[PDB]
Design a protein around this ligand. Structure first.
Ligand SMILES: Nc1ncnc2c1ncn2[C@@H]1O[C@H](COP(=O)(O)OP(=O)(O)OP(=O)(O)O)[C@@H](O)[C@H]1O
Length: 379
């Protein structure tokens, strides 16, 4: 058989991950207990592709980020993401219109054409997460119904995109003074293994997962942008706040080691990396949370660079594993990375980029090493 994009994306895990519920190691959400935000594990199977619907929209918003807000909503199964800043241009796309037999505007190409977007010829120093021109189409292909709304300050464009991209309805274009981009959709929950409608536990888990993703965004975006989840601001705007949120239950009142890792030469020098770490004997193994180019990256040589520097100092000080008692948060942009798949689970880079260009403050390493060695000595 020869498949098309749409049918292939509905059947193949390569685009967004598994298309039913599986065990997702390290799956976390944020939950509220009287004034406090705590990240907690979600020890139930979930559908990776469903979580990717949400992630693709969220990263598109952080990529655009002037942008003063990103508003994420999740209620009655309906997910939406809206950001301000310039809208998607409301102009006819001449290629797509010529090939098709009708008018096709840019927002339809952006949302309905695979391998299409503004990052196809991305520069190596561009720090947007988006690269493939795929992610928004994956959101549409996994939607029972979806609505794209965008406005450019002179016109507003509304288009319904239904039935997993089978039913693209003609857009409605009106004069408007607004300026934003909004995607609203209902995922195909039943096809992805969920109840219709979501069960109480499915709803609670998904809401917690989205809220945590929003909190991660709050630490990544520029200081002019506010992140909202269900109309309430997400105020975990620093790596320190993230580190607290991830360690509040296990190690309350924790000391937070902080550093800004900076590079000497452009383009690396344009992109300092923010780090916060917590050291506790209660931690069973090394864990990191990395938000790189807006993407929650689970594997990359940036982590290894930090671990080796810590290990270097711990071995020396102990003489006078070294990382199993560490939880670390790393947030920032890295130019020149390559992702290993559309999911962007792992970034790829030469380890020597960090060795040549980046400096980890010695005061941060020294402070961490002292606490690490004390734990080792007390054992
Ligand atoms: N929220 C948004 N605001 C503004 N433009 C957007 C937004 N979402 C998508 N776009 C535009 O639509 C294009 C297509 O988005 P899509 O997610 O499919 O591709 P991408 O982000 O370029 O790459 P990737 O497949 O890696 O996510 C983007 O390149 C961007 O130009």
């Amino acid at each position: 058989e020869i498949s098309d994009f749409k049918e292939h994306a509905k059947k193949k895990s390569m685009w967004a991950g598994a298309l039913n519920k599986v065990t997702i190691s390290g799956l976390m959400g944020v939950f509220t207990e009287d004034e406090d935000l705590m990240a907690l594990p979600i020890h139930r199977d979930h559908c990776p592709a469903l979580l990717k619907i949400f992630d693709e929209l969220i990263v598109n918003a952080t990529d655009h980020e002037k942008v003063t807000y990103i508003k994420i909503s999740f209620d009655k199964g309906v997910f939406s993401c809206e950001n301000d800043g310039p809208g998607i241009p409301i102009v006819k796309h001449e290629q797509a219109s010529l090939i098709a037999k009708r008018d096709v505007y840019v927002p339809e190409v952006a949302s309905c054409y695979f391998l299409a977007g503004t990052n196809i010829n991305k520069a190596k120093d561009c720090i947007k997460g988006g690269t493939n021109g795929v992610g928004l189409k994956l959101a549409m292909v996994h939607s029972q119904w979806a609505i794209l709304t965008t406005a450019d300050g002179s016109q507003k464009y509304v288009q319904h995109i239904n039935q997993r991209l089978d039913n693209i309805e003609p857009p409605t274009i009106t004069p408007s003074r607004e300026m934003f981009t909004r995607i609203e959709l209902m995922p195909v929950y039943q096809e992805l293994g969920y109840a219709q409608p979501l069960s109480e536990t499915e709803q609670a888990d998904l809401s917690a997962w989205i809220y945590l993703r929003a909190c991660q965004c709050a630490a990544y975006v520029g200081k002019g942008t506010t992140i909202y989840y269900n109309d309430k601001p997400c105020s975990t705007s620093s790596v320190m706040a993230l580190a607290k949120m991830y360690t509040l239950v296990t190690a309350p009142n924790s000391t937070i080691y902080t550093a800004t890792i900076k590079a000497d030469a452009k383009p690396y020098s344009l992109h300092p990396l923010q780090v916060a770490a917590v050291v506790s004997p209660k931690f069973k193994k090394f864990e990191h949370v990395s938000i790189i180019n807006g993407v929650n990256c689970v594997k990359g040589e940036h982590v290894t660079f930090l671990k080796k520097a810590i290990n270097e100092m711990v071995v020396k000080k102990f003489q006078q594993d070294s990382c199993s008692n560490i939880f670390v948060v790393i947030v920032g942009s890295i130019p020149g990375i390559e992702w290993t798949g559309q999911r962007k689970d792992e970034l790829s880079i030469a380890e020597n980029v960090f060795k040549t260009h980046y400096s980890i403050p010695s005061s941060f390493l020294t402070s961490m090493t002292r606490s690490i060695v004390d734990i080792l000595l007390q054992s």
